[PDB]
C-alpha cells in the first residue's frame, strides 16, 4: 500500500496520503476529516484486513491525521504509486504538482494559490490551504499532492469533479510531519 491507495474506515473510503515513520514505528498520513471519529482502518471494503489504528487527528483548522500500522504483513511503500518519495517540501505558486486518490487515480496540474481559507460549513473552517487546478472526487480525500520525489500536501476538499474540471485544496504536509515528529521515507 502506498500514497493514493484506498483505505477504509467503518463508514467509508478515503485515500492514503504518505507512508511515514518515527524511528522504527510506521504510520500513514491522511486527511483529518477522515480520521475524525474513526478508530480502525482496513485495507479492503470487506473490512477483514486491518491496516491500523488512528493515532491523531486535526480537523478543523487544519486537515491532517495519522494512523499507526498494526499489520506487519502489508507492504508500506515509501512511494505514491510508482513514484518514489524521498523528501517533503513547501508548496509554491506555479509549482508542478500531481495528486493521486483512490477514486480518480493520478491527475497533474499546478499550485494556483497559497494560504486559502476554506469554509466547509458548520464551524468546519480550514486555514492555510494550498489551492490547485487539479480535479478530485469523493474518496480522494487524504491522497497525496507531490512534485516528483517531493511530498507537498494531503487532499482536503474542493469543487467540481474530474469530468467538467474543478479546484482542489490541500493541507501542507510539512505541518502534518512536524505535528507528529514523523518523516517521509
Amino acid at each position: 500500500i502506498s500514497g493514493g491507495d484506498a483505505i477504509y474506515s467503518s463508514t467509508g473510503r478515503c485515500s492514503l496520503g504518505f507512508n511515514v515513520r518515527s524511528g522504527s514505528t510506521y504510520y500513514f498520513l491522511t486527511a483529518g476529516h477522515c480520521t475524525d471519529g474513526a478508530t480502525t482502518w482496513w485495507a479492503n471494503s470487506a473490512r477483514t484486513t486491518v491496516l491500523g489504528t488512528t493515532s491523531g487527528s486535526s480537523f478543523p483548522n487544519n486537515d491532517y491525521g495519522i494512523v499507526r500500522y498494526t499489520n506487519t504483513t502489508i507492504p508500506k511503500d515509501g512511494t505514491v504509486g510508482g513514484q518514489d518519495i524521498t523528501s517533503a517540501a513547501n508548496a509554491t505558486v506555479g509549482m508542478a504538482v500531481t495528486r493521486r486518490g483512490s477514486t480518480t487515480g493520478t491527475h497533474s496540474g499546478s499550485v494556483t494559490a497559497l494560504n486559502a481559507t476554506v469554509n466547509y460549513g458548520g464551524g468546519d473552517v480550514v486555514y492555510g490551504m494550498i489551492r490547485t487546478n487539479v480535479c478530485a472526487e469523493p474518496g480522494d480525500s487524504g491522497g497525496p499532492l507531490y512534485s516528483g520525489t517531493r511530498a507537498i500536501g494531503l487532499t482536503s476538499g474542493g469543487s467540481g469533479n474530474c469530468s467538467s474540471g474543478g479546484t482542489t485544496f490541500f493541507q501542507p504536509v510539512t505541518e502534518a510531519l512536524s505535528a507528529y515528529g514523523v518523516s517521509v521515507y
Binding site: 467509508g12 473510503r13 486527511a31 476554506v118 469523493p138 480522494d140
Partner: protein, 51 residues
C-alpha cells in the same frame, strides 16, 4: 440530515455513501445536501450506505 447551511460551493472529499429517497447513491453528505437543494427539498435520506 441537517442541510440548513447548503448549498455549499466546497465539500470535503470523503466517500461516505448515502441512499436517497430517489433510489440514487450519493457519494457523501455534501453531495447529498446539494442534491437536496437541487430537488427543491423533496429528496430525503432512505438509509446510510449504498442503495
Amino acid at each position: 440530515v441537517d442541510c440548513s447551511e447548503y448549498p455549499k460551493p466546497a465539500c470535503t472529499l470523503e466517500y461516505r455513501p448515502l441512499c436517497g429517497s430517489d433510489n440514487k447513491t450519493y457519494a457523501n453528505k455534501c453531495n447529498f445536501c446539494n442534491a437536496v437543494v437541487e430537488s427543491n427539498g423533496t429528496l430525503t435520506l432512505s438509509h446510510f450506505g449504498k442503495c
